[PDB]
Ligand binder design. Structure first.
Ligand code: 0BJ
Ligand code: 0BJ
Lengths: 148, 148
């Protein structure tokens, strides 16, 4: 398992790419197989593969302006090649103001330079309203692109 | 900062006491001024202090029958005297079946033997229904006890 400071460097580049709020910046630290699973398991939100998130994040970021990320807690388990962060976010969306908070579990690859698995719990009351707004927005971008 | 194995021992006792589901077993790792904070911050849930916890847990535990804890993930940051765990639970309650899942952030005291701060995010759809039900059930116990 890679040295702490290398994993920690991956964590920071993930958070900074998140704050930078472009697809390429944020997805730079995700491996090709990195899955994102929404917790709790009981909410039955299907795990999301990399083709899914590569298609979502451009659309998602385009409808969140003044995105500000705030990191409250980094728990680094260098021996286990693992981490957990707590973050909060705000943005303006086509649907009104957006706020969220995130408990995020990360796993790194052997080299400690990519994130390989993501599991996350968020503000489910924010998401109950926003996920369907986002899904219909995504479908509208899809249809609009296929036409042209 | 205490050695990693001593901090890990408190984690293991915390989860084992939780599993054993008695006020004494679970609380043995809680420092005497340890606070419990519900995330997200945006839901503005007041800190539960140790006295609140000591009154709540005997009632709460008494209406959760067949309680089962499953631990999914332990993120230990010995260098920062911190940790994060992910757990899920089931039980039978007088309000029907119960399921919950917890992303818990733990801080230890200097000795690494007590837990000093708890911040957790849970299944907010469980808690939306359960929390008022437990609050009314707790008031009823306090009333029934007073008049004896
Ligand atoms: C800020 O947005 C992110 O890129 C994001 C990133 C991470 C690591 C977890 C998330 O929960 C989100 C998210 O907020 C989100 C969403 O709000 C709607 C659909 C999918 C998502 O991933
Ligand atoms: C299983 O119960 C616990 O002792 C418990 C314990 C921890 C570490 C987090 C919790 O969220 C709970 C809880 O589930 C709970 C509840 O369901 C209602 C009121 C207070 C609580 O702490």
């Amino acid at each position: 398992p890679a040295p702490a400071h290398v994993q920690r460097a991956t964590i920071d580049a993930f958070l900074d790419g998140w704050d930078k709020w472009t697809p390429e910046a944020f997805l730079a630290t995700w491996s090709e197989d990195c899955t994102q699973k929404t917790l709790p398991y009981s909410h039955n939100v299907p795990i999301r593969d990399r083709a899914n998130t590569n298609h979502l994040f451009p659309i998602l970021m385009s409808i969140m302006d003044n995105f500000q990320l705030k990191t409250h807690n980094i728990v680094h388990d260098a021996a286990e090649n693992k981490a957990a962060v707590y973050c909060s976010t705000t943005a303006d969306t086509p649907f009104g103001p957006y706020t969220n908070e995130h408990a995020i579990f990360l796993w790194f690859n052997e080299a400690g330079d990519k994130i390989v698995k993501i599991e996350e719990m968020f503000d489910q009351f924010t998401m109950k309203d926003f996920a369907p707004q986002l899904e219909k927005y995504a479908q509208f971008i899809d249809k609009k692109n296929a036409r042209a």
